[PDB]
Amino acid sequence: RNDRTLRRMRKVVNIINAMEPEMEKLSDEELKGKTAEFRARLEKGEVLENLIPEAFAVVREASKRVFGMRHFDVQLLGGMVLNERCIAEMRTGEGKTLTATLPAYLNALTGKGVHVVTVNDYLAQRDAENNRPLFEFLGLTVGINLPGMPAPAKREAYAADITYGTNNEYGFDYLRDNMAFSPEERVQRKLHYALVDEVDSILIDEARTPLIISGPAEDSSEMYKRVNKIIPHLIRERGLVLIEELLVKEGGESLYSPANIMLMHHVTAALRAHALFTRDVDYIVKDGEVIWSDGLHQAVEAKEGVQIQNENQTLASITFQNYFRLYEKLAGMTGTADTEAFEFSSIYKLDTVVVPTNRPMIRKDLPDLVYMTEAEKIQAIIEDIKERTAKGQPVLVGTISIEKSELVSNELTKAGIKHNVLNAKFHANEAAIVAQAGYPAAVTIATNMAGRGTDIVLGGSWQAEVAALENPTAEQIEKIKADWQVRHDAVLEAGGLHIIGTERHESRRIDNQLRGRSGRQGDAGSSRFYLSMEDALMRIFASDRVSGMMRKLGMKPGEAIEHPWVTKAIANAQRKVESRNFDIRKQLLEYDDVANDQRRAIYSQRNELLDVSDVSETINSIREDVFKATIDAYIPPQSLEEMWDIPGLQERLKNDFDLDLPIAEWLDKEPELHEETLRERILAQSIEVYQRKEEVVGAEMMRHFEKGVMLQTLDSLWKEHLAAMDYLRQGIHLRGYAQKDPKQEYKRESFSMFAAMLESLKYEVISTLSKVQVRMP
């Protein structure tokens, strides 16, 4: 890791820089042609990574001509990092935007597409539109993906060499591609390269945010009707023994758990709407309706024979994490937050890299200061502000709440320090203050600072000064720049922006984001964090004496020392809280792996179906398994004749497979028969009746109706399964309790239920193709 991979990349950077004159000599057309040359070399078997130096140099030259921007060495380093499965930490102002142009080019060369993942659509459109001329200069096409975009335009967007889009719409496009009924319906290609704009939020904070496609269901009016057909048998354990037995329908064992809940909230409702809601008494039936709660309304409609009011359910679901783990290559960017490299490597095998700034980082991060009380802390803070503003140095003070901002505001005013508070209610004022936030001695209080935030220009923004002018002359802009130079230089001499944190937050990342506001692009700066024994943060030592021992080092109302071990102790606490968080996270991700693997498995199988034209083989093969398994249920393999249930098999075949065979007559006529030949008879009859229907309809039509039925049934059982899993998982605050562990039983019932779903899949597919009505000559 380390400078170990950084010096490797610096070596390459030297090669790229060394390449510059070469690239300066080439024509526009020769630069354009480079892409084709690289692609020809890749086709002829060159390793992409070997092209990094040249390709980057080409891109940089292209940017020099097109944008008039020459990527810095560190941008090249970042681009090289982003070629790996790595997270690139790039300080604010280091031009994450421009840097990202490099690995997009490089990973487009293989001709398999690039997905640039933005935080929102505006940036996707902006970056796409702004970068379009660069990549066309180098003979590549750029796509933009938006929610609500027509499928052909989405297809166009994904078929372009480099695509820009948001995280969400990519995920929804995946779900929709995995709801397609033909491969031409797909919008995406094979998921090749994903570059994610803010991985802190997107891959960590939003890791578990579900992306969901919902719809009106379909499988209403079913389960309900069959559950309804069972209850009127019942009279005022038995009843329960009788109920479970009476499912020559859904489900050895055993409604009651863990899965067969569905059935429970389905039954207690059959039942519950029979003696519990009296017919024309508690409600009325008018105009095909019942005129409720928990499946109970739908049951009444099943009982009274009404149209059941089928209603939204989840059709498709995925977390960001589980979607992005599908890409062949994955990379991302963030602000100097990170702190979680090992987490990214654990969860994603993403190594993270701190990319050095173009100019040196010269912010002085001073040691944390600790006081007995809030009041003394505040006093020291006031004193610090007073000293630095006395030097002409501007200050940004960060607080943890509006009340604290007010508190410090009042105190500063009490001390005669002019300042402005940034109030979330007043956006115009915020922008107006931030314009002057870096003016000599300016003092600004911010509450729970957002993230990255508007650059605060040291000495003020002269650019806002001209944007202010009514009718800007030439010599006004000289007075302005000259004055600005002096202010900027004076502020730089006074030490740049000072950052004051009045508390530390429970999460240090917030502190790092506050602190990140100073020292940008090599500007001078400093930071200081202050703490007290009555800070919220000083609660996490869950012990009054313990925290109360620090009071014996004394502090002396303003005669403090600084103990560099305190800062380490504090950082250690916060990294232990973070470790605690990660332990919890890993546990939750262990639960997520079940559904993730289930989805992955089912979608792999679904796409196997989708990718093939002709499902004959699969049909025949699962036909064998289904009928074999089905006969086995009435004729146990290698058992005696007295165990056979022929009426059961004749009813089951007629009812579920529309196949009326004289098996009783077969057995009683030839004592020659034997199982295998009976199984072959049934098979042969089903086959010939089916091939007859094919001869009625045609081959092509059979292949395509087969596919459709496979997919429809797959989808329907999947959506049902998602819901069963949903109820199962949410049910786990009453199922796993007294002594025995929850989880583990969960994975068992998940696997059991998923297995059940695949065999039911086979059964229902074959049943459907066997029951489909054709007018037989």
How many CB atoms neighbour CB 630 within 10 A?
20
Query: Considering the domain boundaries, does residue 291 fall inside one?
Result: yes
- Could you tell me if 753 and 767 lie in one domain? yes
Query: Considering the domain boundaries, does residue 589 fall inside one?
Result: no
Does 97 carry a binding-site annotation?
yes
CATH number of the domain encompassing residue 137: 3.40.50.300
CB 499 within 8 Å of CB 518: yes
Does 94 carry a binding-site annotation?
yes
Residues facing residue 203 across a β-bridge: none
**DSSP per residue, 463-527:** HHHHHH-SS--SSHHHHHHHHHHHHHHHHHHHTSEEEEESS--SSHHHHHHHHTTSSGGG--EEE
- Could you tell me if 424 and 549 lie in one domain? yes
CA-based nearest residue to 764, from 701, 700, 721: 721
- Could you tell me if 294 and 330 lie in one domain? no
Which class for 103: exposed (0-12), middle (13-18), buried (19 or more C-beta within 10 A)? buried
Angstrom distances, CA of residue 25 to CA of 57, 62, 67, 68: 12, 12, 18, 16
- Sign of the alpha-carbon torsion through 646, 652, 655, 658: negative
Query: Considering the domain boundaries, does residue 651 fall inside one?
Result: yes
Does 96 carry a binding-site annotation?
yes
Pairing of β 285-286 and β 289-290 = antiparallel
- Could you tell me if 339 and 380 lie in one domain? no
Residues facing residue 396 across a β-bridge: 444, 499
- Could you tell me if 280 and 307 lie in one domain? yes
CA 708-713-718 angle, 5° bins: 130
Tokens of 506: 């429970």
> Reported resolution in A?
3.5
> What residues contact residue 477 under an 8 Å CB cut-off, 6+ apart?
466
d(CA 757, CA 748): 14
- Could you tell me if 73 and 154 lie in one domain? yes
- Could you tell me if 369 and 431 lie in one domain? yes
> What residues contact residue 746 under an 8 Å CB cut-off, 6+ apart?
258, 591, 594, 728, 729, 732, 736
- Could you tell me if 606 and 564 lie in one domain? no
Query: Considering the domain boundaries, does residue 112 fall inside one?
Result: yes
* The last residue of a domain, from among 580, 612, 640: 580
- Could you tell me if 398 and 541 lie in one domain? yes
Query: Considering the domain boundaries, does residue 660 fall inside one?
Result: yes
Tokens of 353: 């890299």
d(CA 533, CA 370): 8
Does 75 carry a binding-site annotation?
yes
Query: Considering the domain boundaries, does residue 588 fall inside one?
Result: no
Does 501 carry a binding-site annotation?
no
Query: Considering the domain boundaries, does residue 476 fall inside one?
Result: yes
Tokens of 598: 């289930």
- Could you tell me if 434 and 515 lie in one domain? yes
d(CA 684, CA 690): 10
Q: What domain range is 749 assigned to? A: 595-771
* The last residue of a domain, from among 259, 292, 316: 316
How many CB atoms neighbour CB 752 within 10 A?
12
CATH number of the domain encompassing residue 690: 1.10.3060.10
User: 3-state class of 692 per DSSP?
Assistant: helix
CA-based nearest residue to 392, from 343, 327, 447, 459: 459
Query: Considering the domain boundaries, does residue 586 fall inside one?
Result: no
- Could you tell me if 203 and 177 lie in one domain? yes
CATH number of the domain encompassing residue 287: 3.90.1440.10
CA 436, distance to chain mean position in Å, is: 39
- What total number of domains does the chain contain? 4
The method recorded for this entry reads: X-ray
How many CB atoms neighbour CB 622 within 10 A?
19
Which H or E run contains 90?
Answer: strand 86-90
- Could you tell me if 739 and 631 lie in one domain? yes
